[PDB]
Design a protein around this nucleic acid. Structure first.
Lengths: 104, 79, 93, 95, 96, 79, 92, 106
DNA sequence: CAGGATGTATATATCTGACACGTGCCTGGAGACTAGGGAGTAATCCCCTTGGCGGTTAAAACGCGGGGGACAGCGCGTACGTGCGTTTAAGCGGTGCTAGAGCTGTCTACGACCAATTGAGCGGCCTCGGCACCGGGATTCTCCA
DNA sequence: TGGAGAATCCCGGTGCCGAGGCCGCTCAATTGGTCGTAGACAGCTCTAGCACCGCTTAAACGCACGTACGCGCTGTCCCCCGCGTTTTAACCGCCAAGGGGATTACTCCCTAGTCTCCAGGCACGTGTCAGATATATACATCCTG
């Protein structure tokens, strides 16, 4: 009878409430705030993993590689806006050429 | 002279990753300088992070906290 | 003997793949040289310099992208150090 | 003999829910866990300072909703707002 | 009649030792009300709210114009042009 | 036309305070668009900063907090 | 009851420059500056105490945060003031 | 009796301790932390105000306005890099001219 | 180089609005004393870091032709710089009104907190299949005679 | 321009080691009750934010003329790239020594908490004087000679 079952989310609600409580963010934590935070974290995880699995499908591997995660977040525009100041380890860069660099 | 250990084709490989075709012959000392000053900017913060913990070994955790200070945060070692 | 298309092949190879570009032990000892300046006889985790290498060269290739854009803006294809201080001052360092 | 908490199994369940045939590597698993930890810290810190800005000692769902609207770009922000709102009314409709 | 390029250089110093606001207050106020009406209707603004909005606006404007000036200098030119603005917002990361 | 309320000599004055000598003719509406997207990014944060407070009047305080959120914190208006 | 740090920096200005005054806009800027430094230093000390699983913030975290987020000579003279003040305070 | 007089400072120790308590930075706060923070705010305030007073002095003015604070901040390369992401109202910019814009053969 | 033409710096008269200083008061900081739990300190141990040997070879160092790009010089045509007449809207002052910020009183529902209960979650272990890698053949692919 | 040769893609086979599921324990999540106070709601106040009108005045706008500067073209030379040869330091693998990070246990003292008191800091009022405004004058550049 976990709270994540009645919240409908696979992400933990009690763990998020525990980290919100002794994380000294505030002295009082509401009831719907951990389930809202867990829902947003669920959505962001799903948004990462959907294009990660899609890039794995174009790369014809069934394992998520940090290169696949980097290609997922850098090819998607608001995902790159959210993740502009992070660097992904073993992820590389997008393959791009400036138009004046090609010969002829 | 171990700053020279970052070697003549290493800047070339990093520039080819960066999408640069032609590079000058005087570029190497300048990027060695910017890599050196970046490393003393990050390593010093990692050293004080280690020093506050009464520790004499540098982990990767305080390294990524020092990266988090400069807005250059890193994923894959903060677990 | 192709005149200039080896560099484009190297560009495509290195942007296609994702291994570590800077050679390991010279970097691993350059970390030791810089760390001796702050506190002596410092021990280092292997994963610490493993994270530091991917921290350093990601910044380096972002900088090289920036001076590539500066060199294209200067109607050239060869990067000079003047594009490097362009990138550093304009981006804010 | 130690204990280390992580969100490996939860994003595993999310991954098998959205892609029931794709696996994940351990390095990518740590990248995933560090990403969700960083955005959790970002939203929690913004909600904390936003409650401090209104001299409120309680973090309700409104603070989380406002911090989500701040830290996320537009249609992603209102899609996350919709997911959070339907989760709150799903939890409130149940006991 | 002045040589073209020296009275502008003269009033460079006049606007550079100065400290007041360059843009007129009323068109900026009307522009701010126009762009803020789309997010939520019938808003109200404090007098210092639109005064603080202009401060960062011209601060960001002249911080961008420093950048476009010394980006157009590097291309062996004097005239600033819109591709130096693209260079400034690209190297700063504000565009991509 | 209210975006054009901020004008050619005002843009030329702001660029002149920025230290430029010669200005092309295609500069002005480009920096008009730059100012428009900058005020979009600031005002979008500020409007929900007022909206959370059960408030419908934008003060100077939440503008300062929005500018602190974009990493361009401003002094002289409290905070 | 609006809370501010005006008269403290007024005594600081009088003991560092006893023949000048300060405007009210510069007063707002100085108050915002000292508040921004307070928030930055206290937040760094907060997350530094959290990083080591310590619930107490003492002068060690404040000193290390000062060494972190201030530049070199500024931080060196800042800790030179800070430890001298903590030794003057702990002696009485 | 006043803890600032005990620490020999002008900034309030008790007020810094109070906003450290209610600023929810930790569950508990020590005794040397507010006096250390008060000493740091002492030194930083003294350093900005000294160069501000000098910038007022060579401008032959006995009043500190934000242009003097801007001149004090950007002249020295320590507090300028401390708060490089900070804009000051009524501040202006340092007078800087790139050398390629001056006329020659004059 | 040398003499007019202006824009900028310097010197009084003054005047006004912001700024320095005095006053009450009240709320927030200080004095004193206790509880307890969080930090300090010590002993153990075992993982992980440091150091060394030695074979191997990929990679770095070096040298040399050559070609193509950086850079200097020159011509041009146009597009901004500068000045002047004119319109126009910003700025300032006045009135007037009301929507909406700010604060005080209540109470109640929501959240902290503790005891009892238990099952999801995490360390250890084991297995097999996705994937890295080697090798041969087909497929582009780019330079030239 | 066909084609010689070089790089690349692809398919088949192999072998490996880390994903991924199972199992046992455990401690953190859940449930139930209490009780304390944070904020939701109403209502009163009052203040500053639109809303409009009139003057005035310096800023903006349109236009005329010019010139210098951005851009296109050409020559040159030099310096970096491609490639062959030589060397050298990184990589892999393995083996010990021990160092200190982490864990657990026991104490102690330091800070939260509470009560009482009093004085420092803030809102407000008011002189007052230093920067703003105006007028007159020297002078430091630029423009053409």
């Amino acid at each position: 009878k976990t709270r994540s079952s009645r919240a409908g989310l696979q992400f933990p609600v009690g763990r998020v409430h525990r980290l919100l409580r002794k994380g000294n963010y505030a002295e009082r934590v509401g009831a719907g705030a951990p389930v809202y935070l867990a829902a947003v974290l669920e959505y962001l995880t799903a948004e990462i993993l959907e294009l990660a699995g899609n890039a794995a499908r174009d790369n014809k591997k069934t394992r998520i590689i940090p290169r696949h995660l980097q290609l997922a977040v850098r090819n998607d525009e608001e995902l790159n806006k959210l993740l502009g100041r992070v660097t992904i380890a073993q992820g590389g860069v997008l393959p791009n050429i400036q138009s004046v660099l090609l010969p002829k | 002279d171990n700053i020279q250990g970052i070697t003549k084709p290493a800047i070339r490989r990093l520039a080819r990753r960066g999408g640069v075709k032609r590079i000058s012959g005087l570029i190497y000392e300048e990027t060695r300088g910017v890599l050196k000053v970046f490393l003393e900017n990050v390593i010093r913060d990692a050293v004080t992070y280690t020093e506050h913990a009464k520790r004499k070994t540098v982990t990767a955790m305080d390294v990524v906290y020092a990266l988090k200070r400069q807005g250059r945060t890193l994923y894959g070692f903060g677990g | 003997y192709r005149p200039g298309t080896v560099a484009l092949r190297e560009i495509r190879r290195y942007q296609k793949s994702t291994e570590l570009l800077i050679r390991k032990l010279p970097f691993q000892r350059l970390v030791r040289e810089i760390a001796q300046d702050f506190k002596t006889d410092l021990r280092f985790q292997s994963s610490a310099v493993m994270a530091l290498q991917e921290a350093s060269e990601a910044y380096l290739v972002a900088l090289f992208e920036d001076t590539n854009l500066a060199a294209i803006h200067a109607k050239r294809v060869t990067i000079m150090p003047k594009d490097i201080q362009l990138a550093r001052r304009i981006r804010g360092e | 003999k130690t204990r280390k908490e992580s969100y490996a199994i939860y994003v595993y369940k999310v991954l098998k829910q959205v892609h029931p045939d794709t696996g994940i590597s351990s390095k990518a698993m740590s990248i995933m866990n560090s990403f969700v930890n960083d955005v959790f810290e970002r939203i929690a810190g913004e909600a904390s300072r936003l409650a401090h800005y209104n001299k409120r000692s309680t973090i309700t769902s409104r603070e989380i909703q406002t911090a989500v609207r701040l830290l996320l770009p537009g249609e992603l922000a209102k899609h996350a707002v919709s997911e959070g709102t339907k989760a709150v009314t799903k939890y409130t409709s149940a006991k």
